[PDB]
Write an enzyme that holds these catalytic residues in place. Structure first.
Site, mmCIF file in Angstrom:
data_model
loop_
_atom_site.group_PDB
_atom_site.id
_atom_site.type_symbol
_atom_site.label_atom_id
_atom_site.label_comp_id
_atom_site.label_asym_id
_atom_site.label_seq_id
_atom_site.Cartn_x
_atom_site.Cartn_y
_atom_site.Cartn_z
ATOM 1 N N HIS A 128 0.811 -1.205 0.000
ATOM 2 C CA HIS A 128 0.000 0.000 0.000
ATOM 3 C C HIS A 128 0.853 1.268 0.000
ATOM 4 O O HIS A 128 0.320 2.357 -0.197
ATOM 5 C CB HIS A 128 -1.067 -0.028 1.098
ATOM 6 C CG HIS A 128 -0.621 0.427 2.438
ATOM 7 N ND1 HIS A 128 -0.309 -0.424 3.471
ATOM 8 C CD2 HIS A 128 -0.528 1.673 2.940
ATOM 9 C CE1 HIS A 128 -0.028 0.289 4.550
ATOM 10 N NE2 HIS A 128 -0.165 1.563 4.254
ATOM 11 N N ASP A 163 -0.133 -7.554 1.806
ATOM 12 C CA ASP A 163 0.374 -6.175 1.801
ATOM 13 C C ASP A 163 1.898 -6.179 1.950
ATOM 14 O O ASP A 163 2.460 -5.934 3.017
ATOM 15 C CB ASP A 163 -0.291 -5.356 2.897
ATOM 16 C CG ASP A 163 -0.018 -3.861 2.783
ATOM 17 O OD1 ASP A 163 0.470 -3.424 1.734
ATOM 18 O OD2 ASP A 163 -0.325 -3.146 3.778
ATOM 19 N N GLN A 208 -0.034 6.184 11.263
ATOM 20 C CA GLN A 208 0.175 6.679 9.905
ATOM 21 C C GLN A 208 1.601 7.171 9.737
ATOM 22 O O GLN A 208 2.125 7.892 10.582
ATOM 23 C CB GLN A 208 -0.802 7.825 9.636
ATOM 24 C CG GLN A 208 -2.232 7.354 9.333
ATOM 25 C CD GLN A 208 -3.105 7.163 10.553
ATOM 26 O OE1 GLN A 208 -3.040 7.933 11.511
ATOM 27 N NE2 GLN A 208 -3.976 6.156 10.499
ATOM 28 N N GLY A 209 2.228 6.773 8.639
ATOM 29 C CA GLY A 209 3.600 7.120 8.384
ATOM 30 C C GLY A 209 4.597 6.065 8.830
ATOM 31 O O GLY A 209 5.764 6.101 8.406
ATOM 32 N N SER A 235 3.775 2.870 8.196
ATOM 33 C CA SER A 235 3.466 1.827 7.240
ATOM 34 C C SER A 235 4.681 1.419 6.450
ATOM 35 O O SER A 235 5.479 2.245 6.022
ATOM 36 C CB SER A 235 2.396 2.297 6.268
ATOM 37 O OG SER A 235 1.161 2.371 6.906
ATOM 38 N N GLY A 236 4.784 0.108 6.227
ATOM 39 C CA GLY A 236 5.892 -0.463 5.495
ATOM 40 C C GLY A 236 7.085 -0.817 6.328
ATOM 41 O O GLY A 236 7.959 -1.540 5.854
HETATM 42 N N1 LIG Z 1 -2.433 1.564 14.338
HETATM 43 C C1 LIG Z 1 -2.047 0.699 13.181
HETATM 44 C C2 LIG Z 1 -1.825 1.481 11.934
HETATM 45 C C3 LIG Z 1 -0.618 1.421 11.273
HETATM 46 C C4 LIG Z 1 -0.400 2.118 10.104
HETATM 47 C C5 LIG Z 1 -1.382 2.876 9.578
HETATM 48 C C6 LIG Z 1 -2.592 2.949 10.216
HETATM 49 C C7 LIG Z 1 -2.815 2.261 11.392
#
Ligand SMILES: NCc1ccccc1
Ligand SMILES: [Ca+2]
Length: 223
Positions: free
Chosen positions: A40, A84, A174-175, A177-178
């Site tokens: 994503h 993902d 958020q941020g 991710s990955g």
């Molecule tokens: N709280 C888990 C999460 C991780 C990445 C993006 C959104 C939510």
């Protein structure tokens, strides 16, 4: 990362920042020429930034290398976030040292109750927004599949696990991710999704890397 601690510069040497003019996702260095991240996080025009602590200051250990090829998992579903995971090949090999180093892929899947390290430059607030400039860290356990499925009915596949705290307060966000989830010195997870950040009964959900080792190895060997 909500409720974490400042890691310290270059203490997480496999952590990368994906940059498209700005930091937008994390990733993990798995050998001198390949990074694994979340599908994503895909976009065109990725520069991989290694050796970072403060992402807004050049501190002296950075390596900035543009991607030559991105490979999203063949079965990624953007609606459910199943599968993902994404591989990124660097245009040239990174120089590896104590501050920039690869993380090993797992031999076996980690069990519920194992403590892991999650890291990233994502939001540090459950309500509102504050983005750190330095890398944040969180120690968190893998939750049982039964707890995970009870938190997210109908949404957890065999390619996902939950980690964190059902009481809330500590989570990825958020941020992040990955980025990596490392347990016992091996890459076990990728920061994927959840409902908000650090809310009660809504732990983070992570891509289960041990299910993908064959795909990763075969893909690297032929690209
Ligand atoms: N709280 C888990 C999460 C991780 C990445 C993006 C959104 C939510
Ligand atoms: Ca920097």
């Amino acid at each position: 990362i909500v409720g974490g601690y400042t890691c310290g510069a270059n203490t997480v040497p496999y952590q990368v920042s994906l940059n498209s003019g700005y930091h937008f996702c994390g990733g993990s260095l798995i050998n001198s020429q390949w990074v694994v991240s979340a599908a994503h996080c895909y976009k065109s025009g990725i520069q991989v930034r290694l050796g970072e602590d403060n992402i807004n200051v050049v501190e002296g250990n950075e390596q900035f290398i543009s991607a030559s090829k991105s490979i999203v998992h063949p079965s990624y579903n953007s609606n459910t976030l199943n599968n993902d995971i994404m591989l990124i090949k660097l245009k040239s090999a990174a120089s590896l040292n104590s501050r920039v180093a690869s993380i090993s892929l797992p031999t076996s899947c980690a069990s519920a109750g194992t403590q892991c390290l999650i890291s990233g430059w994502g939001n540090t607030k459950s309500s509102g927004t504050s983005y750190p400039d330095v890398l944040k860290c969180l120690k968190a356990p893998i939750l049982s599949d039964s707890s995970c499925k009870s938190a997210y009915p109908g949404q957890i596949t065999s390619n996902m696990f939950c980690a964190g705290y059902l009481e809330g307060g500590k989570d990825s966000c958020q941020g992040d991710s990955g980025g990596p989830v490392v347990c016992s010195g091996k890459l076990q997870g990728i920061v994927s999704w959840g409902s908000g950040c650090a809310q009660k009964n809504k732990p983070g959900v992570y891509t289960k890397v041990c299910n993908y080792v064959s795909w990763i190895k075969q893909t690297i060997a032929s690209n």
